[PDB]
DNA sequence: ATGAGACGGGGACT
DNA sequence: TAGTCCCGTCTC
């Protein structure tokens, strides 16, 4: 209902505004150097600019800056333009986002890009719903921070660093994925966000989250809203010797119910914890089978994932699936062999260990083992096979657990 | 037809 | 050391 307490508001127009104030002036004084904000600033045409814009945020989702710096910068120098990009291949695209993660977004972005040069005539939408609406891979979030950033759109946005922010600075521990939470949260920042400076805003209260309001131990004392946080005025009272009202049991006759409120953990009462139930175990066996090549070798067999499910359309060495009692077995594993080489002399197959791979859903083991030939295999390679020297497997468009497996079969080598 | 599960990998920190 | 948390979008 809209009869939430004023703890949880800003029913005051002097802390919104003292709140807008506050953070745009650290966020001038504190503002990391990153090469999306710098394409951005320079860019006059709304086009790139807004391309700039978007491939950072899609290499962002669920991922921390530190990582998407480079990527960001190969794919924009690859890539500068959204015709560059309508123009690659998908399996370009999987080459540059090898070891980044969650791969479907990079081939949405890669979608979009094409949508937005064959159909919109290389014009990118202009607000936040139209963005979301007809770009795929562009979510609520995503459409938020391209329209402010871009296009100065007064729209705020909610991220991982501003629940965490908001739900400290009014105090909310309810469940903040439930929909009654998300709504509130997103009224907040909509509310919030600077009508003069709406992406610098949200760019500075995401870096708030980022750098001062952080998971564990925030630097409250380095914080400009401080004085403005509910989480830091309740930790400052303790034993105190303003507060929800609303905060009342209707029953006043079942037993008082007790606040858990754990004065150790402070502000960070806030927001509460996503508890996390751990992924399922799967099994498999794969196999680095090796031939001498030419200058440049050994060459090392790859082939191609389905276009759907886990790492979809990524190559890897070839492998099967296992169930957890036949995790050793070789029979499947070597009739997958011969699917790609022909008949193989199956006493070379070598035990290398052992790797355990952890999606967010899943950990992965596989047994792994290496196969090295004398020779070519003795029929022309089969559609779908690659042969690739050790630097083209390194390039290529593969998950990063084929590369734990290469670097295992590369140390036992000899 | 809505909401939990699918969907990668690693940085920071104990 | 080994363990833990957490940095959005879509669907099946
Ligand atoms: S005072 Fe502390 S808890 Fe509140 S917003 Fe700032 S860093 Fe976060
Ligand atoms: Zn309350």
């Given at each position: 209902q809209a009869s939430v307490s004023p703890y949880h508001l800003f029913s005051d127009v002097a802390d919104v505004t003292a709140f807008r104030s506050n953070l745009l002036s650290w966020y001038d004084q504190e503002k990391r150097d990153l090469p999306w904000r710098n394409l951005a600033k320079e860019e006059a045409n709304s086009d790139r600019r807004a391309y700039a814009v978007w491939v950072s945020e899609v290499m962002l989702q669920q991922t921390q800056v530190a990582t998407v710096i480079d990527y960001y910068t190969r794919w924009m120098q690859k890539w500068p333009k959204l015709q560059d990009l309508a123009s690659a291949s998908l399996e370009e695209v999987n080459q540059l986002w090898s070891?980044?993660?969650?791969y479907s977004r990079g081939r949405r972005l890669q979608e979009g890009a094409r949508k937005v040069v064959?159909?919109?005539?290389?014009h990118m939408p202009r607000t936040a719903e139209t963005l979301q609406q007809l770009?795929?891979?562009?979510?609520r979030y995503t459409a938020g921070a391209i329209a402010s950033?871009?296009?100065?759109?007064?729209t705020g946005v909610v991220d991982g660093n501003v629940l965490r922010v908001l739900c400290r600075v009014r105090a909310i521990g309810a469940d903040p994925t439930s929909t009654l939470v998300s709504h509130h949260l997103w009224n907040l920042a909509q509310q919030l966000?600077?009508?003069?400076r709406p992406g610098d805003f949200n760019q500075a209260a995401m870096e708030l989250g980022a750098?001062?309001?952080?998971?564990?131990?925030?630097?409250c004392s380095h914080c400009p809203v401080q004085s403005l946080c509910r989480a830091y005025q309740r930790v400052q009272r303790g034993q105190l010797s303003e507060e929800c009202a609303?905060?009342?049991?209707?029953?006043?006759?079942?037993l008082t119910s007790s606040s858990?409120?754990?004065?150790?953990m402070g502000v960070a009462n806030f927001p509460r914890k996503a508890s996390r139930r751990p992924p399922r175990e799967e099994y498999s066996a794969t196999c680095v089978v090796e031939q001498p090549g030419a200058?440049?070798?050994?060459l090392v067999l790859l082939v191609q994932r389905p276009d759907?499910?886990?790492?979809?359309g990524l190559w890897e060495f070839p492998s099967v699936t296992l169930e957890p009692s036949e995790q050793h077995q070789h029979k499947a594993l070597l009739q997958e062999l011969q699917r790609w080489?022909?008949?193989?002399?199956?006493?070379?197959?070598?035990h290398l260990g052992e790797v355990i791979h952890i999606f967010s859903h899943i950990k992965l083991t596989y047994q792994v083992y290496s196969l090295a030939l004398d020779?070519?295999?003795?029929?022309?390679?089969?559609?779908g096979a690659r042969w690739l020297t050790w630097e083209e497997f390194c390039n290529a468009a593969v998950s990063t657990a084929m590369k734990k497996v290469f670097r295992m079969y590369e140390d036992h080598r000899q």
């Open positions: 070891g980044l993660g969650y064959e159909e919109l005539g290389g770009l795929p891979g562009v979510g950033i871009a296009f100065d759109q007064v966000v600077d009508p003069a750098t001062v309001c952080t998971p564990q131990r925030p630097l609303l905060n009342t049991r209707q029953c006043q006759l079942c858990p409120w754990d004065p150790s200058i440049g070798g050994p759907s499910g886990l790492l979809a080489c022909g008949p193989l002399p199956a006493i070379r197959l070598q020779q070519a295999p003795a029929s022309t390679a089969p559609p």
